[PDB]
């Protein structure tokens, strides 16, 4: 009853799933789990001037995302990562920008945008040759170690680790540079998952293609191991204009595979793979920060 990841990906897509509430021009950078049988989605927001964050009211079907309440967080958690940390029975929301490069907060109730604890440092390091600094963290643990992965808008992917028993905690300043390519090839939006039923981990990285944003995939047998390109070109992407089946967007950008198990292992089921992504009208132009990004969901066609 186990499935493998395909070598070539083909998706079908929803249309735009929701419009930003009054005061925002974009919904972005989604992170999602299933919580009590419902979709639980955090994201960045943009007013065009600054980024903030929000959580949607829980909803059972993606087709009902359009009517879900949009609940602003009073303290911004830009480009968030949401998961349940089972060893301490606590929810974790990690994010960028504030007192430290990466930050996290904890909660016993992840549906509440303002029930999160005081911010704690997640990462305090700095990288070279980046206009942004550390960007788009994710967190993932195996049975032994908690890993931090992140990007730098500069062609590099970075990794840090600690024994799981030391988490929640600060990774500190140290990191490993694990991948290095052109800025376009390894840009941002990095995510890492355990492939359920396989001795395999899946990494996806957002790249800048000729036709728009797309994702390149890599696999590893271990979270500390080397990453092998999988579907890693614009013509044969993990997800992009070439294979999304989306008509409303030519961009497949920063989001999260749908995680049915909300825990720190970031486990995905290759038999029912879905991708909650951000896209935008091909006609939308202007300053990056003002782009009208919207949620969509891809469903893998097997
Ligand atoms: O609490 C306070 C903090 O909030 C504060 O955080 C700072 C907030 O501003 C941050 O600057 C942003 C860095 O990230 C950028 O997003 C990039 C922009 O570039 C995009 O890529 C471009 C797309 O178009 C192409 O043509 C072009 O070639 C690409 O480069 C990319 O997709 C985005 O992710 C934002 O635009 C910046 O506003 C800053 O880093 C934070 O430090 O700090 C103080 C603290 O007290
Ligand atoms: Ca993310
Ligand atoms: Cl490491």
Nearest CA to ligand 1 atom 46: 98
Ligand 1 probe mutation, 97, 126, 136, 210, most atoms within 8 A of CB: 97
Backbone interruptions in the chain following residues (C to N > 2.5 Å): none
| Rounded Cα distance, 22 and 230, in Å | 40
Ligand 1 atom with the smallest distance to the CA of 289 is: 36
| Rounded Cα distance, 272 and 234, in Å | 23
Nearest to 91 by CA among 52, 139, 54, 56: 139
| Rounded Cα distance, 231 and 6, in Å | 9
Structural biology method used: X-ray
Which 3 state secondary structure label does DSSP give 289? helix
> What six digits make up the tokens of 5?
């990841």
Question: Which secondary structure element, helix H or strand E, spans residue 176, and what is its range?
Answer: strand 176-180
What order of strands is seen across the sheet that includes strand 145-151? 135-141, 145-151, 156-163, 176-180
Which ligand has the minimum distance to the alpha carbon of residue 150?
2
Backbone angles phi, psi at 301, to 5 degrees: -90, 115
DSSP state of 88: G
| Rounded Cα distance, 20 and 40, in Å | 16
Nearest CA to ligand 1 atom 20: 288
Cβ of 126: how many Cβ atoms within 10 Å? Answer: 12
> What six digits make up the tokens of 161?
């680790």
Ligand 1 atom with the smallest distance to the CA of 98 is: 1
| Rounded Cα distance, 211 and 246, in Å | 13
Nearest CA to ligand 1 atom 2: 98
State the chain's maximal CA–CA distance in angstroms: 49
| Rounded Cα distance, 136 and 189, in Å | 5
Nearest CA to ligand 1 atom 30: 153
Cβ of 232: how many Cβ atoms within 10 Å? Answer: 20
Ligand 1 probe mutation, 130, 185, 288, most atoms within 8 A of CB: 288
| Residue 256 lies in domain | 1-302
> What six digits make up the tokens of 230?
């999988």
Question: What CATH number corresponds to the domain at position 243?
Answer: 2.115.10.20
* Distance in Å, CA 224 to ligand 3 centroid: 7
Q: Which residues surround ligand 3, an ion (CB under 5 A)?
A: 159, 161, 176
Nearest CA to ligand 1 atom 13: 132
Nearest to 272 by CA among 300, 231, 238: 300
Which 3 state secondary structure label does DSSP give 31? strand
What is the number of domains present in the chain?
A: 1
Cβ of 251: how many Cβ atoms within 10 Å? Answer: 26
* Distance in Å, CA 135 to ligand 1 centroid: 9
* Distance in Å, CA 296 to ligand 1 centroid: 23
* Distance in Å, CA 177 to ligand 3 centroid: 9
Q: Which residue has the tokens 């039923």?
A: 197
């Amino acid at each position: 009853g186990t499935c493998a990841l395909p070598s070539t990906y083909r998706w079908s897509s929803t249309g735009v799933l929701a419009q930003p509430k009054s005061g925002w021009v974009a919904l972005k950078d989604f992170t999602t789990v299933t919580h009590n049988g419902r979709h639980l989605v955090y994201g960045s927001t943009s007013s065009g001037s600054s980024y903030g964050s929000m959580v949607f009211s829980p909803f059972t079907n993606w087709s009902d995302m359009a009517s879900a309440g949009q609940n602003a967080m009073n303290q911004a958690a830009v480009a968030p990562t949401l998961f349940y940390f089972a060893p301490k029975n606590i929810w974790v929301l990690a994010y960028q920008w504030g007192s430290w490069p990466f930050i996290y907060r904890t909660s016993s109730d992840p549906t509440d945008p303002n029930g999160w604890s005081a911010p704690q440092p997640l990462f305090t390091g700095s990288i070279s040759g980046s206009d942004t600094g550390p960007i788009d963290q994710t967190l993932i643990a195996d049975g032994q170690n908690m890993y931090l992965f992140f990007a730098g808008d500069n062609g590099k992917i970075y990794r840090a680790s600690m024994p799981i028993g030391n988490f929640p905690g600060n990774f500190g300043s140290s990191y490993t540079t694990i991948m290095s390519d052109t800025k376009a090839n390894l840009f941002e939006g990095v995510q890492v998952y355990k492939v359920q039923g396989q001795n395999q981990y899946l990494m996806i990285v957002e790249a800048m293609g000729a036709n728009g944003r797309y994702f390149r995939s890599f696999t590893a047998s271990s979270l500390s191991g080397s990453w092998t390109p999988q579907a890693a070109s614009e013509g044969n992407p993990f997800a992009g204009k070439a294979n999304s089946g989306a008509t409303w967007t030519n961009d497949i950008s920063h989001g999260d595979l749908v995680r049915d198990n909300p825990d720190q292992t970031m486990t995905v089921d290759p038999c029912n793979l879905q991708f909650l992504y951000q896209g935008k009208s091909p006609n939308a132009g202007g300053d990056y920060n003002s782009l009208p990004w919207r949620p969509g969901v891809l469903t893998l066609r097997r």
